[PDB]
Write a protein that binds this DNA or RNA. Sequence first.
RNA 1: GUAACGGGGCUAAACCAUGCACCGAAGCUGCGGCAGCGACGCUUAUGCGUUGUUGGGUAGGGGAGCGUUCUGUAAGCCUGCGAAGGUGUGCUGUGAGGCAUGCUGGAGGUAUCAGAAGUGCGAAUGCUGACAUAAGUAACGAUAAAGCGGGUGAAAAGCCC
RNA 2: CCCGGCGAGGGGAGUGAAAAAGAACCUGAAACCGUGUACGUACAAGCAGUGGGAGCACGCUUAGGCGUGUGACUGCGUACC
Lengths: 110, 103, 56, 150, 142, 117
Amino acid sequence: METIAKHRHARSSAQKVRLVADLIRGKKVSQALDILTYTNKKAAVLVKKVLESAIANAEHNDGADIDDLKVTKIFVDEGPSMKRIMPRAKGRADRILKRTSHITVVVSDR
Amino acid sequence: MYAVFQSGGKQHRVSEGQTVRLEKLDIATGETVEFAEVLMIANGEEVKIGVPFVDGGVIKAEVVAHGRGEKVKIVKFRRRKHYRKQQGHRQWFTDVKITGISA
Amino acid sequence: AVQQNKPTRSKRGMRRSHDALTAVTSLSVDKTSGEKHLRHHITADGYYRGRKVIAK
Amino acid sequence: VTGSGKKPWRQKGTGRARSGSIKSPIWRSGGVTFAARPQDHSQKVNKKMYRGALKSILSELVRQDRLIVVEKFSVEAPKTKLLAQKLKDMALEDVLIITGELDENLFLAARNLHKVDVRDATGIDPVSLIAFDKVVMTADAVKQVEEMLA
Amino acid sequence: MKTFTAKPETVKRDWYVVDATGKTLGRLATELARRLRGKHKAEYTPHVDTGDYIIVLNADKVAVTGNKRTDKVYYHHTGHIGGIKQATFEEMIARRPERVIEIAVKGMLPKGPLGRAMFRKLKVYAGNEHNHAAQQPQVLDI
Amino acid sequence: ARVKRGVIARARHKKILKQAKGYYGARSRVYRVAFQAVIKAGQYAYRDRRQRKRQFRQLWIARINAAARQNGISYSKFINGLKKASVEIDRKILADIAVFDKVAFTALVEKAKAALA
RNA sequence: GUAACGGGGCUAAACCAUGCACCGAAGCUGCGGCAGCGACGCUUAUGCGUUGUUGGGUAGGGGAGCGUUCUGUAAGCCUGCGAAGGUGUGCUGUGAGGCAUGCUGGAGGUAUCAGAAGUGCGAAUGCUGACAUAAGUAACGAUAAAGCGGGUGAAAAGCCC
RNA sequence: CCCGGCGAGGGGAGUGAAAAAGAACCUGAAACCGUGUACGUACAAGCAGUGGGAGCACGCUUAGGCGUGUGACUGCGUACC
Ligand SMILES: [Mg+2]
Ligand SMILES: [Mg+2]
Ligand SMILES: [Mg+2]
Ligand SMILES: [Mg+2]
Ligand SMILES: [Mg+2]
Ligand SMILES: [Mg+2]
Ligand SMILES: [Mg+2]
Ligand SMILES: [Mg+2]
Ligand SMILES: [Mg+2]
Ligand SMILES: [Mg+2]
Ligand SMILES: [Mg+2]
Ligand SMILES: [Mg+2]
Ligand SMILES: [Mg+2]
Ligand SMILES: [Mg+2]
Ligand SMILES: [Mg+2]
Ligand SMILES: [Mg+2]
Ligand SMILES: [Mg+2]
Ligand SMILES: [Mg+2]
């Protein structure tokens, strides 16, 4: 049974979150959670929280039994940018985009 | 055990039972054309037209659906000369089956 | 100095051919407390090689 | 277009592109290269061609026997229901019924009847002559359309 | 009914042995190369390597014509500084003769990837025997 | 009568991007690039229709020669022969018997060799 | 950088002379096809077995058409048994296109013949918006400077003691 | 109701004809970014296609030496205004 959890409007680029996400993909939910705890990227926490929520979602809303779960699917798409300006030298004003992601985790037992 | 014959404006090596696509051919869909000037026949031991066409070799086939090939595009485009035209062309063909090869 | 043509979405890819993080693998469990922990590191509840060190 | 004569930015120098009026038809908001004005689409039509046309269309109505002349077409009071009756009676639904001097009731009837329309002889126009399945017309009126077209 | 294509996976090949000895290099290369390329059969398929494996022999004794032996060009460039080295024909027969015939038929096979493969089929040798007895090379000429 | 424009426009761009599938990067993604990409594909295939006919004949000739030469005659003479051979006409394509009937071929060389004697 | 035969290589695979084969173009021929402009024979609200012939083309002239909005035809016609639009596919047209139909969508669309045009875009350093690139690079704003203990807190180098 | 910081966001439940309407809400194209699968790709040199073309993969019909995708190898080939 699939069962999934996601974080939309995550305040990280995507490129960065993906970096963490690829560590985890297709791992035993257990081994996933470990790889995350000991990864020093702020995305790690962002994605650990999803995995967790997702596992919880599994156990509570469906078959559960977190013993078999795998992160069978994880992919993060890019959310909207918040748009800003950077006062710069000689009156020039620069753009700058604060970027966000939508993290999606899908956990199951098959 | 095959033979060769001029029929498109082109020639074709052919054996009985075998279908070939020729250029168009008035002959109505089901009838039987008879190619009566074959330029070679062969088994294990064979007959070249010492002249053109082997003495009495003929070939028989039944037309078997007429048709138009898959469209193709003609593009002409002359760079910097404000010029180009595109064109579509198809091409009638008739298909014959080959029952003959009367040695 | 600035680029003369936009780089393909492919070159980005290739440039990043090395960006992948490496997962840890190298953590273990304390013989005396639950406690996973990086090799050669204090466990959170404060253990190291059994023997509870660092009382905090 | 509501705006100002001011030139958005210099000619030379900012790496931009000429510009000269925030109202350029090519600029966004504000423009319109050949803005319309209100105009009169009336066309002339020679007299002899108007009369010539009508004749040409009566003749064809007649040739398709869509022209069905009667002596006196009229009704007893201004009641669409009444008319609707006569029509049902005469095998009519799409009709012209151009009468001689026009009564008023028959105009008052017919009004809500949508596939039908009554006119006085001197009224009669090209299209409405064509627009209906049949056009009726009384002897009373033909004498008139006669004179008219000459 | 389209014309035939040799097919890399069904193509035959075959081994041969050629004595370079007195042969006039280049009239020899010319042959090696054409056989090297399959140009003698169902070549009839220029995208497919239909050539035969030919093992050459006694290259050092290859023969030349005119004054070439002492005078034949032979240039090359290391792509460094101003690195253009050159060697005379006899200089080359002197150190690793194999080379003359190789560099020879190479210039005669085509172009790039394919032709480049075709050339691996050719196993030369300066001496008079070779260690490909198992391939059962059949002798030939030109 | 102010005119929408756009559906009839998206019709066209799509028409071109569709002809440009499998083309690389923007060639297959970006109209402005896609177009010039289609047009040349077009021009190449008009050229190459003509070309094809050259290519095969040269394929054929090449292999006629391999075979003729194997039976101890040069392509040139072999053709000449066939030509003199009590008339005796017969496509170069057709002379694929060359591959698929080596005995019918030697036949041909003989007929040819003879009309040359 | 060989670099003054395209290369390999050639003593002929060079020059001269005679000869006969062959290869070779979108030329010429063959088979099928379309059209413009003429004119036979079959026969005219004529198109034809047709038939001779022509069919590179910028500027420019001429001819014939596609499609878009809106008026009428239409209180008709199609449509919640699924309109417009979006996305596939199939067949068709010389083309601009047309028609069908799966998916999506969920309220409108209109044949035909005519009528009118804010009718067709890749380029004007065009206008607006959206989104890429360089790049997870530069940088994070005076080189007066930090260290540790306790705290709160989900988290504390940066707050509080 | 559950994960979470009495968050952000999310999974169920439920309303509804529909949440393939959930408030950034009708339709929801394009550039541009991803996950998944077939095929290709680490001796290969250029407007990236086009002509020929193996192989693999998927559909064929009871084969028939076909359709679709991919595209080793190979001839030709310096974008548009
Ligand atoms: Mg300032
Ligand atoms: Mg305005
Ligand atoms: Mg007047
Ligand atoms: Mg070449
Ligand atoms: Mg000739
Ligand atoms: Mg030709
Ligand atoms: Mg012309
Ligand atoms: Mg011409
Ligand atoms: Mg509309
Ligand atoms: Mg545009
Ligand atoms: Mg232009
Ligand atoms: Mg950094
Ligand atoms: Mg850099
Ligand atoms: Mg740096
Ligand atoms: Mg730095
Ligand atoms: Mg919506
Ligand atoms: Mg390789
Ligand atoms: Mg390269």
